[PDB]
Amino acid sequence: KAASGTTGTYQEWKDKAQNLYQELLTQEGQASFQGLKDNVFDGLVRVTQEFHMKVKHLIDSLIDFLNFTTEVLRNLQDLLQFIFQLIEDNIKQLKEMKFTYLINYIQDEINTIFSDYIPYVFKLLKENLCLNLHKFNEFIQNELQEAS
Amino acid sequence: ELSATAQEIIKSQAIATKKIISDYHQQFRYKLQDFSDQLSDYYEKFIA
Numbered sequence: 001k002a003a004s005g006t007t008g009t010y011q012e013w014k015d016k017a018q019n020l021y022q023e024l025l026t027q028e029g030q031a032s033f034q035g036l037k038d039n040v041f042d043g044l045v046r047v048t049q050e051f052h053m054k055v056k057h058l059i060d061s062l063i064d065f066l067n068f069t070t071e072v073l074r075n076l077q078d079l080l081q082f083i084f085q086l087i088e089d090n091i092k093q094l095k096e097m098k099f100t101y102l103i104n105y106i107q108d109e110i111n112t113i114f115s116d117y118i119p120y121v122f123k124l125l126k127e128n129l130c131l132n133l134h135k136f137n138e139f140i141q142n143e144l145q146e147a148s
Numbered sequence: 149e150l151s152a153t154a155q156e157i158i159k160s161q162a163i164a165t166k167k168i169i170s171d172y173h174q175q176f177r178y179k180l181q182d183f184s185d186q187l188s189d190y191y192e193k194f195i196a
Binding site: 003004006007 | 151154155
């Protein structure tokens with residue numbers, strides 16, 4: 001009974017293992033993460049806009065609270081709004097220039113290099129060895145002639 | 149394959165496991181019979 005149950009459970013779970021293998025292949029392809037980056041950038045933009053509104057409201061309320069300085073506070077409000085706009089622009093840029101591409105690029109580069117460039121380097125070493133040996137022979141022949 | 153191998157191994161073990169006990173129980177009984185027979189002639193051997 002124990003053996004039967006164990007075999008049944010293993011065969012049951014074999015399928016999800018292959019599903020996870022497919023998911024891993026997709027991840028190595030780097031094709032399921034960019035969406036999360038876009039979502040987080042959108043959330044960041046939304047939160048930045050909300051905080052922009054809250055901060056300007058706070059400054060406006062503070063002016064009246066103090067009156068219950070003014071020009072400086074208004075200029076500070078304008079500058080803070082400018083900084084908020086800069087932050088929003090930077091977030092939009094970061095969303096535009098996502099980093100997901102270079103990971104797959106380097107993965108492909110290493111996969112190609114291992115199977116392509118390494119044998120060529122070995123061949124370079126072999127050729128250099130033979131060439132240096134032959135040059136050694138030439139130079140020793142010349143030196144021996146001079147010694148004789 | 150592993151499950152089948154394990155099942156056949158345990159099946160092979162079980163028969164010999166039973167066989168040993170089956171062999172030993174009958175001799176266990178025959179020993180009691182022999183001892184009971186022995187007790188009968190103790191007094192006569194002693195006296196003789």
